[PDB]
Ligand binder design. Structure first.
Ligand code: 6ED
Ligand code: MN
Length: 296
């Protein structure tokens, strides 16, 4: 069965360290760039309100067939959901799948089952992911001073915070956050960012998001293993298309000498990915994440 990779670094900045995100990320870089990804827990009292327009939030998530590569056009037929109705679907799926309440399923069991399903020919599990929803559609999950929604006085600090993903620097010398509504086993395959950018990711609420990261010094190693083992039909494809289908069990990479680190990101925690750090992951259950690429 699946062997979990070693844990990536988790930082718990003091209020002083938490004052300036870019300065903090610059200070942790000597360790975090050797692991590709890191997790950042804000101070206990830092709790932004959730600011999306929940009444109107509606979307059609994309269908994900976990074993689609191993299996090598009308299978499912995706409903439109609200946040509430997607959550009911997601929780019913997971509690039915594991025969237990959703909060009682061990994170290690979901992880082992996910990778078993990805390689399974005998069982075809299909899930849905509300992925790549623009923050322009119904707003960011962070409060923003654009006069579209009311900001209470207690929330203004969060609208002005440098850790609000809307306030991260995005202009490179010579771009808004995206939202992800997850359910159990919804996933993202191995990729790096455009322009080898940093990215920052915040889990607003819900069950954890499980991550795998590879430090940039091993980017070429990972790409070589991919070419050796990815389907040939897709191996010859340019990277920006191959990255749509680069699903690979972390233990395969590890057997080929590629360093891989993991983490479970819980509600209210950040994950930072460093330049050219390949990353992949899946969701443990119903959750809501926001992500943006940023410039230093
Ligand atoms: O789901 C997450 O939490 C997540 C975290 C970090 N990075 C990416 C994440 N998800 C996804 N990102 N993109 C796209 C963005 N990025 C550029 C474009 C690319 F080349 F496809 C390669 C991924 C998807 C697309 C579909 C999907 F189901 C899922 C994602
Ligand atoms: Mn990414």
């Amino acid at each position: 069965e699946f062997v979990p990779p070693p844990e990536c670094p988790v930082f718990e900045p003091s209020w002083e360290e938490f004052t300036d995100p870019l300065s903090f990320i610059g200070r942790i870089r000597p360790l975090a760039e050797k692991t590709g990804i890191c997790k950042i827990r804000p101070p206990k009292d830092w709790q932004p309100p959730f600011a999306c327009e929940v009444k109107s939030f509606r979307f059609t998530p994309r269908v994900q067939r976990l074993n689609e590569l191993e299996a090598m056009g009308f299978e499912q037929a995706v409903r439109e959901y609200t946040l509430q109705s997607f959550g009911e679907m997601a929780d019913n799926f997971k509690s039915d799948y594991f025969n237990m309440p959703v909060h009682m399923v061990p994170t290690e069991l979901v992880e082992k089952e996910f990778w078993r399903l990805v390689s399974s020919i005998e069982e075809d599990v299909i899930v849905e992911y509300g992925a790549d929803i623009s923050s322009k559609d119904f707003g960011s999950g962070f409060p923003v001073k654009d006069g579209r929604r009311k900001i209470l006085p207690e929330e203004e600090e969060y609208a002005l915070s440098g850790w609000n993903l809307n306030n991260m620097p995005v202009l490179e010398q010579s771009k808004v956050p995206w939202l992800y509504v997850g359910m159990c086993f919804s996933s993202f395959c191995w990729h790096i960012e455009d322009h080898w950018s940093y990215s920052i990711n915040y889990l607003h609420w819900g069950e954890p998001k499980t991550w795998y990261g590879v430090p940039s010094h091993a980017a070429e190693q990972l790409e070589e293993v991919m070419r050796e083992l990815a389907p040939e039909l897709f191996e010859s494809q340019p990277d920006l298309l191959h990255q749509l289908v680069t699903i690979m069990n972390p233990n395969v990479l590890m057997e080929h000498g590629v360093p891989v680190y993991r983490t479970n990101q819980c509600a209210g925690e950040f994950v930072v990915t460093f330049p050219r750090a390949y990353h992949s992951g899946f969701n443990q259950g119903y959750n809501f994440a926001e992500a943006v690429n940023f410039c230093t």
